[PDB]
């Protein structure tokens, strides 16, 4: 998966991904 994903925060800031 896409890094941030794994990662809450990273993918609140990159709603793109998750």
């Given at each position: 998966?896409?890094p941030?994903c ?6 609140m ?6």
């Open positions: 998966r896409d941030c794994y990662h809450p925060t990273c993918n800031s990159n709603p793109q991904i998750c």
